[PDB]
Design a protein around this ligand. Structure first.
Ligand SMILES: COc1ccc(S(=O)(=O)N(CC(C)C)C[C@@H](O)[C@H](Cc2ccccc2)NC(=O)O[C@H]2CO[C@H]3OCC[C@H]32)cc1
Lengths: 99, 99
């Protein structure tokens, strides 16, 4: 769909069987979600944002549905102010910026 | 134009006659630029993201040129690692997310 930006681009995603709200974030290389229970092995990792670094758990080849569109990729779980969908998953669902 | 997200959506912007690279960021509510000299009064402010908060200076009605498109809005200047063009200016150049 065509999404304008007068409002935050929040969409419903389905991950690990549950529905959650996430922000389509083109300024994010990675996808990071608030703490949650996800099956599978995970590896500790570190990522930084505008205010510093945080510790996250990294889950690979995770299935995620964004507004109906399927994606399978890396998801980082940790202390983020909001669930963010980064370019690693945005490219999988064919999302582009237009103007 | 149409920007793919294989790479960071880095674009050239013009401000005060000077050019620079900035990120077209749908996850950013406001626009944040790297420390720079700007004339005009400002208002103290703190913005937060992954890792915590940073102190920035808020300037209003600043004119920026992104890809030949003009936009006028508020910009926050602070110790950010990347120049960020947020939704406050993105909406003015008629930028949309599509998938
Ligand atoms: C009021 O105005 C604001 C403007 C901007 C922000 S923000 O920068 O914390 N933010 C975070 C978003 C969830 C709000 C926007 C994201 O797109 C923000 C932009 C950014 C900041 C620093 C370095 C590179 C990229 N991206 C971000 O934190 O991405 C994370 C996840 O993937 C990684 O790639 C780049 C850094 C890492 C916060 C407030």
């Amino acid at each position: 769909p065509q999404i304008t930006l007068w409002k935050r681009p929040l969409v419903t995603i389905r991950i690990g069987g549950q529905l959650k709200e996430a922000l389509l974030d083109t300024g994010a290389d990675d996808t990071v979600l608030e703490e949650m229970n996800l099956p599978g092995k995970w590896k500790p990792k570190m990522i930084g944002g505008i205010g510093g670094f945080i510790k996250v758990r990294q889950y690979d080849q995770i299935p995620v549905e964004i507004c109906g569109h399927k994606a399978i990729g890396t998801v980082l779980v940790g202390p983020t102010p909001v669930n963010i969908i980064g370019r690693n998953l945005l490219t999988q669902i064919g999302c582009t910026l237009n103007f």
